Amino acid sequence: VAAERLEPRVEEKDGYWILKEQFRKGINPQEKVKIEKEPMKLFMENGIEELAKIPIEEIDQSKLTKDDIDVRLKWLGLFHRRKNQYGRFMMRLKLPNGVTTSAQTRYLASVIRKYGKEGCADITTRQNWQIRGVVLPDVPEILKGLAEVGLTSLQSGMDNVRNPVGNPLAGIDPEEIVDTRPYTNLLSQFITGNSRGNPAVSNLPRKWNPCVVGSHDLYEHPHINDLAYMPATKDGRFGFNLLVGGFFSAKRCDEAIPLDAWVPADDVVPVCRAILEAFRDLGFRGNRQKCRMMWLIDELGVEGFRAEVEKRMPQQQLERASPEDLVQKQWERRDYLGVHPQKQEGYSFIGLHIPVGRVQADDMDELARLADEYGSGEIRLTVEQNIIIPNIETSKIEALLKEPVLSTFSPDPPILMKGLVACTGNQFCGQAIIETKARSLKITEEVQRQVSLTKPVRMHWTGCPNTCAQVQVADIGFMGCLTRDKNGKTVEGADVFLGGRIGSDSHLGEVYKKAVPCDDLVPLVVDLLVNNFGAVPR
Numbered sequence: 210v211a212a213e214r215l216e217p218r219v220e221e222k223d224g225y226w227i228l229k230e231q232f233r234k235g236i237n238p239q240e241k242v243k244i245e246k247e248p249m250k251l252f253m254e255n256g257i258e259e260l261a262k263i264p265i266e267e268i269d270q271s272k273l274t275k276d277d278i279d280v281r282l283k284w285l286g287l288f289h290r291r292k293n294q295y296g297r298f299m300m301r302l303k304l305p306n307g308v309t310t311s312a313q314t315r316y317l318a319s320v321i322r323k324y325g326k327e328g329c330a331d332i333t334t335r336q337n338w339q340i341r342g343v344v345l346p347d348v349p350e351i352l353k354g355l356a357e358v359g360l361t362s363l364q365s366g367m368d369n370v371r372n373p374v375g376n377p378l379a380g381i382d383p384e385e386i387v388d389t390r391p392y393t394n395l396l397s398q399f400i401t402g403n404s405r406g407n408p409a410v411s412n413l414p415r416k417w418n419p420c421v422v423g424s425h426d427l428y429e430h431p432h433i434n435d436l437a438y439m440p441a442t443k444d445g446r447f448g449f450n451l452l453v454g455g456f457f458s459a460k461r462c463d464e465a466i467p468l469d470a471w472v473p474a475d476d477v478v479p480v481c482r483a484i485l486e487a488f489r490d491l492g493f494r495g496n497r498q499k500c501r502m503m504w505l506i507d508e509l510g511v512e513g514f515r516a517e518v519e520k521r522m523p524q525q526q527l528e529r530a531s532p533e534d535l536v537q538k539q540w541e542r543r544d545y546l547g548v549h550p551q552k553q554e555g556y557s558f559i560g561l562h563i564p565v566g567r568v569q570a571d572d573m574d575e576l577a578r579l580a581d582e583y584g585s586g587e588i589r590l591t592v593e594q595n596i597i598i599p600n601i602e603t604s605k606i607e608a609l610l611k612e613p614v615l616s617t618f619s620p621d622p623p624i625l626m627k628g629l630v631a632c633t634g635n636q637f638c639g640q641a642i643i644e645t646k647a648r649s650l651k652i653t654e655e656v657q658r659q660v661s662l663t664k665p666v667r668m669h670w671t672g673c674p675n676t677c678a679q680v681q682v683a684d685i686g687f688m689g690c691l692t693r694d695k696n697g698k699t700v701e702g703a704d705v706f707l708g709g710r711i712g713s714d715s716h717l718g719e720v721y722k723k724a725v726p727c728d729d730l731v732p733l734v735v736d737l738l739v740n741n742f743g744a745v746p747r
């Protein structure tokens with residue numbers, strides 16, 4: 210690698226970071242959008258106020274403003290559903306560690322309630338909230354309303370640092386390694402500039418996913434994050450070994466690799482900053498399929514990339530990885546659904562199944578009511594698109610289990626539902642090839658009617674090769690495709706994946722059988738469960 214390759218390609222100009230004039234050749238169209246107008250100005254210079262007043266039909270008549278609503282608004286967490294729900298915006302938060310309050314939940318419910326049939330909300334595979342139905346004229350008021358209740362939607366889409374994932378049992382599990390909340394909180398504060406915007410990390414070549422591990426279970430999926438903090442003691446000091454570059458895409462899925470770096474616990478933010486600066490400064494900005502950070506690591510080599518991180522650390526210090534980390538390889542991932550005692554004597558948490566992560570406003574209000582009546586007004590989201598209500602006095606559990614809403618959001622649903630994960634799909638997502646959420650529920654219900662089993666089989670449904678629902682981690686994964694029935698008619702189908710493992714002994718699954726019509730999946734899956742996962746026909 211020539212020394213010229215290491216020249217930073219972006220520069221700070223008037224509070225924002227822009228590609229240098231000599232590093233603009235051959236850039237992709239998204240890079241051109243970012244140069245044409247700085248997306249962060251919509252928030253930081255209140256550009257949204259005037260934009261929101263322009264009728265959408267008028268907005269669509271010019272490239273600049275159409276790009277504002279279709280692309281730049283993703284820096285404010287707003288996602289125009291142009292193809293499948295025209296004129297409506299999905300809105301996505303920052304929610305470090307998946308932690309929400311009842312007041313925040315009620316606020317979000319109040320926003321979606323306004324939109325009637327166009328509104329609903331979803332828990333995401335980064336333990337985050339998305340709300341739906343938003344119209345552009347309401348955006349300024351919603352941004353103000355979010356801030357009022359202590360929420361931000363900043364930098365949650367496009368070429369930004371995505372939701373910092375942590376241990377859903379942080380602070381409450383007797384078996385936790387380290388409470389991840391302080392760290393994910395710090396990361397989110399750093400990323401968003403304390404909810405004011407942080408332009409230093411908002412012009413990346415591509416999206417970038419961070420997580421902080423605090424569980425032996427590895428609930429945080431460190432193997433598939435761009436930066437994963439693995440708790441590790443080194444030379445008598447608590448800190449983190451760092452894994453880098455994990456990612457999924459249509460073209461390529463790769464597990465994170467060791468940076469060969471350990472940082473003291475207090476250096477979590479400094480090293481996040483150093484890694485992001487190196488990625489921002491040096492990353493490829495051509496073909497979008499080759500812009501994730503792993504591609505830079507491969508170009509420089511991991512040692513070459515490490516040197517770039519090291520030079521950007523305070524005092525240019527970056528220790529080598531600790532020989533061992535604190536995560537115990539002797540471990541079985543634990544079910545968190547149901548009632549579990551906390552480390553605080555006399556308290557329990559309850560994990561509740563949210564079918565395919567989908568809720569309506571009334572459901573949100575009810576969950577918020579439960580968290581207030583039974584817990585501490587806290588609702589935690591999980592990456593399987595479920596919830597945990599922590600901090601419940603154990604003597605209240607008997608009454609809680611009788612609450613009518615628990616018949617819908619159950620502490621003990623059938624085992625296949627416990628592990629079911631599904632992306633948005635074509636109800637709202639323009640890239641989706643198939644409908645996912647309704648279909649996956651229907652198929653799973655039919656499968657479980659036919660077989661019983663005791664193994665916690667994890668089934669993931671994703672609507673297109675972007676694999677937002679992570680089919681490569683599943684015991685059985687389903688990737689949307691179009692295929693053909695016996696008469697040659699177009700039908701929805703799935704490419705079926707097998708081989709995904711999570712926890713310490715992680716492994717990426719691969720296509721097992723292509724082009725299976727969705728209407729033919731039940732017998733295939735029933736047989737796979739009996740033959741490979743110990744299921745028994747009813």
Ligand code: SRM
Nearest residue numbers: 299333334335337456457458631632633637638675676677
């Ligand atoms: C909501 C969510 C799936 C869900 O049902 O839970 C989701 C939904 C979408 N993803 Fe994703 N992704 C979601 C997690 C993921 C993950 C999983 C993860 O983070 O562990 C991945 C795979 C892992 C990874 O990225 O390394 C993922 C890979 C993508 C990709 C492919 C990235 C790539 O490098 O090629 C895109 C397309 C892109 O960014 O170019 C995409 C694009 C999109 C968009 C924003 C596309 C769009 O504008 O329509 C989807 C919005 C649909 C909608 O209305 O909801 N989404 N997306 C997840 C939101 C997470 C969050 O709260 O921030």
Ligand code: SF4
Nearest residue numbers: 632638641672673677
């Ligand atoms: S996997 Fe495809 S269909 Fe599903 S939410 Fe992601 S982009 Fe949309």
Ligand SMILES: O=N[O-]
Nearest residue numbers: 365366367416677
């Ligand atoms: O928002 N899915 O990258």
Ligand SMILES: [Cl-]
Nearest residue numbers: 283366367368
């Ligand atoms: Cl995006």
Ligand SMILES: [Cl-]
Nearest residue numbers: 290291292639
């Ligand atoms: Cl679209």
Ligand SMILES: [K+]
Nearest residue numbers: 563566593594
């Ligand atoms: K779920």
